[PDB]
Design a binder for these strands. Structure first.
Lengths: 125, 121, 69, 160, 159, 45, 133, 260
RNA sequence: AGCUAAAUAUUGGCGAGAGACCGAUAGCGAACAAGUAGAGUGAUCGAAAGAUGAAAAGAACUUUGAAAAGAGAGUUAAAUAGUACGUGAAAUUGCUGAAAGGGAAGCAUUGGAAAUCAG
RNA sequence: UUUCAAUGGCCCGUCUUGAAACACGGACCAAGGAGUCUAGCAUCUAUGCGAGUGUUUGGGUGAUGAAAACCCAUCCGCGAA
RNA sequence: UUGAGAAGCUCAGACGAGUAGGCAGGCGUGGAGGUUUGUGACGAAGCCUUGGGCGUGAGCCUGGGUCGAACAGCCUCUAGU
RNA sequence: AAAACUUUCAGCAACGGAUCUCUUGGCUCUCGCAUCGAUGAAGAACGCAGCGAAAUGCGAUACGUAAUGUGAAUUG
């Protein structure tokens, strides 16, 4: 149970805060688990998703597909992964968005900031 | 002691046929001039305690058993000793899987089921 | 519901949210260092004064006092 | 003790009573007759006996005042033999000097329980059609599929 | 869209409909009632005659204010009118229903108007009465008792 | 549009704009060998 | 009336006992106790320990070991300093009345204890409180 | 309560008599669909409710401190009766003893696994399993109002000193931990129903005499308080009726249900 | 002639946490373009209006039509979800089926016939 | 269930009067829609205590929701003349 | 003889219009605490139905259809019932 | 006396938008804090985006500039 008067348990407030979140806040909201191998290598359970990360879809009709993230659609909380598309009637392909929590990061797009972020969260690189 | 019914027709509310806004559920006429309230000639009947049925056969189905609403198998086992007195009636919101478990267990206990064939076939 | 509250409901500028309210949090001791080192933040000031050997008030208490034992 | 307990459970509230149209039923695991009352409530009656199922073996459960304070050891259990006559003899010798009303309820339960075991074995031997469930989502979908399948089949032109 | 009638299956039938049509519902109902059950080509001739005033549409249900004409004697009534806008809509729908049947591969010569119905569209104080119209054109144990059977056996043996 | 009357009005303007432009190209155009109606049977695996 | 308006389970148990005694014995005492059990609080005025003491040792006295019985509360009387030895059966004893009777005197009984000691109510003084309010 | 101005913010008066209109006030002006519409009435749309709720409704109820202490004493005594716990709905069928008292090492627990392990050892974990399996979504508008989930009640842990017992037990679903000095009726008779399963520590049990006292000695922790006395000495009326003293004086019992 | 903290008040201001409250004719007039559209010379007055789907995958393509649309087709778990979009009551309307009908009708009682249920 | 036959069956509410009839309301359906909250007094019943009785102005206290629960110093109210 | 939900069981007799008024017991709805090892995408709620059943009645249960996310019995609490 | 018409019942389709579920809203309570303006406020008007009408933001540096934080978007 929550014991802090600074956090609200109200459903109305929590749903307003979730769907009213700015992009900097949705960046945290769109987090994915690190794979077992990455977890034992970096000592980090989960990370925010970033473009060009290598992920595997874990849930849904696309369970098992893998690919890089071609776009994080923060305004809809969606990940557009390459080759995970849908064929429209006319023959064009509409990419299918996957929630960040339904994928798992198999390889990270490491930068100086990501390494700094990793060691910041009690991690090792 | 056969099941005897003092009446089979329901008691429809006065003028409920003429008007759709007037439901068929019985309502006591309060008008001090209501001819049916005064029980005039040819008027429809009104519910009376004399219409009540024999206490021995009251609440009993034509087969002679009383209906007992059952939601899961546990309620079925509750009717182990009253299978000659009570018939299991499976609830409408009980899913198909639990119905087959209820019906099969009722068959073992020798308990009649009023709607055994529903959502089970 | 006010015009001034409807003004920022439909606005894009975020509310000036401050997080300061945590009840049951008693004021921490500044002032005396010896009292601060021996003050347990959970207890009440009457419990703390009595444990330390001090009188919270030199006058009668206006109510029943706790009897734990 | 017992009288006050009955006044609390039998007339305020009990989590074993299914209020019925003309009778209440005791969901208690020990009510011999199945309907709760002063003569049937295990809660209200300290000295109680019952007959119940256990993996094909009927068992006699008994409790008394001397064990009422210890729920773990309150009930005691013995096996009833397959033979009906010997089973009644065991019940009589176990419930000796117990009220004849209490023994009568136990023997009534044992008779019913024996009928239950006989019918269960008979239905186990006998073959019956298995009753499958019905899926509303499947039924609605397959219906729409067949309406579209028939409209696209063109049976008359194909036969002609 | 699902229609009111059991037919319009692929077997022998075709469909056509028009919704929110800016015509009078009362006149459309009279036209639909008149042309119902006719052969498709015969209905086209009748509709053309109505445009030319060689035939009339009987106003059976909605007959308030309709003058008497001798052209209604064919349908056994005296009150008949010549709604032109409603005939235009029904002519168009019959053209469309014919085209749908042609694409399907039906036999045009045996086509009858199996089902034609008019419904009120949402009202659109001069709230008009638009009409929904849909047209479907289609090609045209007991036992015996002991005494009963024994008598039957005795009777059969005597024969 | 979270306003139901407005989202309906924009859709009707969108529908008219789409239908008008679809037949603007249709009348300009007026093929059968390539463009054929695809069916479930043609899409069978 | 034939049942008490009180929903107290222990009072209902007392009524259950005295229903049996009234119809299975010939004691007008048991019939009286049952009727007074059905009475409301207003019609069961409290009786003082002083009035019990007065009535027992009244006129010819002759109280001996006869038990005083009241269907109601027995209140204390701080006015009298000396308390006689008494045996009273009552619905309720106030904490002061019970202490004074026990410490300096005899016994306090519940109405079920009386039913075991005097099931027919023999050698009992069935007293009542003043209903003048 | 509702707004004290809701239903009044419009301007409207009755159009009068003799105009073939119900004489309810109607909204003045024109050019909007509200114009001419009725207002100021329980029967009217966008009108005032009948007797608008007020915040000075009586919410809190006084109870004499003696009756509250009576009910809390009655709640504890009911907790010591095994049959009332079963009717309450507690899975105490394998509890070694009622009242269940554990040693004082429990008050110094630190981990939820230590508290769960103890519950299993005394076989009180069946009541926890019942609570976890009972968690359902609330039916009705309650879940729109921060009342999202419902569940049964587990055991009540009563301690004397808090050296980690409260935090060790507090995440176990259904378990409520309370100081023996401030026993709560809302937790001792939840729903108004007697007989909650209580687990006492040794120190909490040993101080119960100071908290409540006896029927003849004052409570140490409640000044001038004595445990209430009973209307009856013996609660087994059936034994009293069938006792030797009464069965030896009652006249011969007439027949039970007689023949017609 | 003069000043003065604290305990006290607070339908506003900047925030926060709650509720045995209301649930779209309710709750603020306003859950959505709400003091908006609109009305009045003006002071003022002042609404109606929430819900496709998990995803727009929002129906390519062919055909008819001047077009709007229709019909095959397609997407979908589902179009008994096609934006006139969750569920879809009644009033009311059209259609088909069955039956009744010589200046009212509804209803009650008893049965017959036809249809349909327990069986 | 529909329908037929025989038999019976005056339109509901409101108001007026000894009583009717007038007269007023009623095109139809859905949703809404009227003895409520509070202060005082009185009766009766229940509950607690009882020559007493009333914790909640306030204080203490409450780590797990702390607006709860729990505790009560001095007064005061009513009663006991 | 098992027939002690003592608030239960059983036997017997008489009686049955009813305005004002008085008294009693029940049905239903929103929400709250408790409980039912409660129901539910293998279909909750709702709706529809010349399906069935129960109650003198208020009402309740159920089959079939439609439907797509929650709801109910029991004991008490509460009311914008 | 068949049809039409009228009515009744059932089915289907309309019309309508009740019901049910929901809910970034309202309402009520409690708690913390004290901050408009001649250094031009509140309010009004007009403007500003690659493609914008409202609402939002902003003011010719015009859906923003600097600075700091985050660390890779925006999205029709």
């Amino acid at each position: 149970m929550k014991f802090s008067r600074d956090v609200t348990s109200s459903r109305r407030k929590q749903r307003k805060a979730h769907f009213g979140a700015p992009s900097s806040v949705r960046r945290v909201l769109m987090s994915a688990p690190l794979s077992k191998e990455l977890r034992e290598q970096y000592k980090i359970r989960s990370l925010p998703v970033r473009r060009d990360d290598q992920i595997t879809v874990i849930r849904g009709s696309n369970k098992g597909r893998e690919g890089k993230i071609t776009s994080v659609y923060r305004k809809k909380f969606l990940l557009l992964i390459e080759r995970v598309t849908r064929e429209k009637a006319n023959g064009a392909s509409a990419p299918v968005g996957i929630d960040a929590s339904k994928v798992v990061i198999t390889k990270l797009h490491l930068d100086k900031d990501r390494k700094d972020l990793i060691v910041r969260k009690g991690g090792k690189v | 002691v056969n099941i005897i019914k003092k009446r089979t027709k329901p008691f429809k509310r006065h003028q409920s046929d003429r008007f759709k806004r007037v439901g068929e559920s019985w309502r006591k006429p309060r008008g001090i001039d209501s001819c049916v309230r005064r029980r005039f000639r040819g008027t429809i009947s009104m519910p009376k305690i004399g219409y009540g049925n024999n206490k021995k056969t009251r609440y009993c189905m034509p087969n002679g058993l009383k209906a007992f609403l059952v939601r899961n198998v546990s309620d079925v086992e509750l009717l182990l000793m009253h299978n000659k007195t009570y018939a299991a009636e499976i609830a409408g919101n009980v899913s198909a899987r639990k119905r087959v478990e209820i019906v099969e267990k009722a068959r073992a206990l020798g308990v009649k089921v009023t709607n055994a064939g529903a959502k089970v076939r | 519901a006010n015009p001034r509250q409807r003004n920022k409901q439909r606005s894009g500028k975020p509310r000036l949210t401050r997080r300061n309210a945590n009840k049951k949090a008693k004021a921490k001791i500044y002032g005396n260092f010896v009292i601060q080192q021996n003050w347990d933040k959970h207890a009440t000031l009457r419990q703390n004064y009595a444990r330390l050997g001090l009188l919270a008030t030199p006058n009668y208490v206006t109510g029943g006092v706790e009897k734990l034992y | 003790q017992d009288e006050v307990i009955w006044q609390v459970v039998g007339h305020e509230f009990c989590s074993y009573r299914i209020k019925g149209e003309a009778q209440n039923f005791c969901r208690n695991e020990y009510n011999v007759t199945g309907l709760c009352n002063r003569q049937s409530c295990p809660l209200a009656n300290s000295r109680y006996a019952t007959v119940r199922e256990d993996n094909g073996k009927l068992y006699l459960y008994m409790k008394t005042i001397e064990r009422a304070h210890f729920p773990s050891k309150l009930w005691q259990r013995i096996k009833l033999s397959k033979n009906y006559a010997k089973a009644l003899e065991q019940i009589d010798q176990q419930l000796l000097y117990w009220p004849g009303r209490q023994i009568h309820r136990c023997k009534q339960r044992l008779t019913r329980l024996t009928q239950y075991l006989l019918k269960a074995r008979r239905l186990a031997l006998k073959h019956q059609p298995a009753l499958i469930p019905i899926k509303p989502k499947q039924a609605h979908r397959e219906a729409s599929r067949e309406r579209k399948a028939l409209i696209a089949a063109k049976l008359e032109k194909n036969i002609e | 869209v699902r229609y009111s009638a059991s037919p319009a299956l692929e077997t022998k039938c075709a469909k056509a409909r028009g919704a929110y049509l800016r015509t009078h519902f009362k006149n459309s109902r009279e036209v639909a009632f008149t042309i119902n059950g006719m052969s498709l080509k015969k209905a086209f001739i009748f509709l053309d005659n109505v445009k030319e005033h060689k035939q009339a549409v009987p106003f059976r249900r909605f007959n308030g204010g309709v003058g008497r004409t001798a052209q209604g004697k064919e349908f056994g009534v005296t009150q008949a009118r010549w709604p032109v806008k409603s005939v235009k809509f029904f002519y168009d729908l019959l053209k469309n229903a014919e085209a749908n049947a042609e694409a399907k591969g039906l036999d045009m010569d045996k086509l009858i108007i199996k089902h034609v119905q008019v419904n009120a569209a949402p009202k659109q104080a001069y709230l008009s009465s638009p009409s929904h119209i849909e047209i479907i054109v289609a090609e045209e144990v007991s036992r015996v008792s002991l005494k009963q059977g024994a008598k039957a056996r005795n009777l059969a043996a005597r024969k | 549009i979270k306003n139901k009357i407005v989202r309906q009005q924009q859709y009707m303007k969108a529908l008219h704009q789409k239908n008008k432009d679809k037949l603007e190209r249709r009348k300009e155009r007026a093929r059968l060998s390539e463009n054929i109606p695809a069916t479930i049977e043609s899409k069978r695996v | 009336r034939s049942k008490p308006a009180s929903e107290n389970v222990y009072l209902k148990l007392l009524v259950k006992l005295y229903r049996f005694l009234a119809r299975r014995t010939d004691s007008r005492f048991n019939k009286a106790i049952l009727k007074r059990l059905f009475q409301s609080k207003t019609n069961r005025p409290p009786i003082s320990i002083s009035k019990i003491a007065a009535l027992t040792s009244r006129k010819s006295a002759s109280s001996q070991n006869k038990t005083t019985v009241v269907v109601g509360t027995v209140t204390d009387d701080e006015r009298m300093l000396t308390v006689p030895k008494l045996s009273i059966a009552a619905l309720r004893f106030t904490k002061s009345a019970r202490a004074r009777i026990l410490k300096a005197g005899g016994e306090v009984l519940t109405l079920d204890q009386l039913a075991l000691r005097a099931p027919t109510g023999s050698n009992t003084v069935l007293v009542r409180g003043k209903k003048h309010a | 309560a509702v707004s004290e101005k809701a239903g009044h913010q419009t301007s409207a008066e009755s159009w009068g008599t003799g105009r073939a209109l119900a004489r309810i006030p109607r909204v003045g002006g024109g050019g909007t669909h509200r114009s001419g519409q009725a207002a100021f009435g329980n029967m009217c749309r966008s009108g005032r409710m009948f007797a608008p709720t007020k915040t000075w409704r009586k919410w809190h109820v006084k109870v004499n401190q003696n009756e509250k202490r009576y009910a809390i004493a009655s709640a504890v005594a009911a907790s010591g009766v095994p049959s009332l716990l079963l009717a309450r709905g507690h899975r105490i069928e394998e509890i070694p003893e009622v009242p269940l008292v554990v040693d004082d090492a429990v008050q110094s627990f630190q981990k939820t696994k230590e508290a769960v392990a103890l519950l299993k050892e005394i076989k009180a974990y069946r009541d926890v399993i019942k609570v976890a399996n009972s968690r359902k979504l609330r039916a009705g508008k309650g879940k729109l109002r921060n009342r999202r989930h419902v569940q049964r009640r587990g055991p009540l842990v009563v301690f004397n000193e808090d050296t980690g017992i409260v935090k060790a037990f507090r995440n176990i679903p259904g378990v409520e931990i309370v100081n023996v000095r401030r026993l709560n009726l809302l937790q001792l008779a939840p729903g108004g129903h007697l007989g909650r399963f209580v687990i006492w520590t040794k120190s909490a049990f040993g101080l119960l005499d100071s908290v409540f006292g006896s029927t003849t000695e004052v409570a140490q922790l409640k000044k001038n308080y004595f445990l209430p006395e009973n209307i009856i000495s013996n609660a087994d009326v059936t034994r009293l009726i069938n006792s030797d003293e009464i069965q030896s004086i009652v006249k011969a019992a007439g027949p039970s249900r007689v023949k017609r």
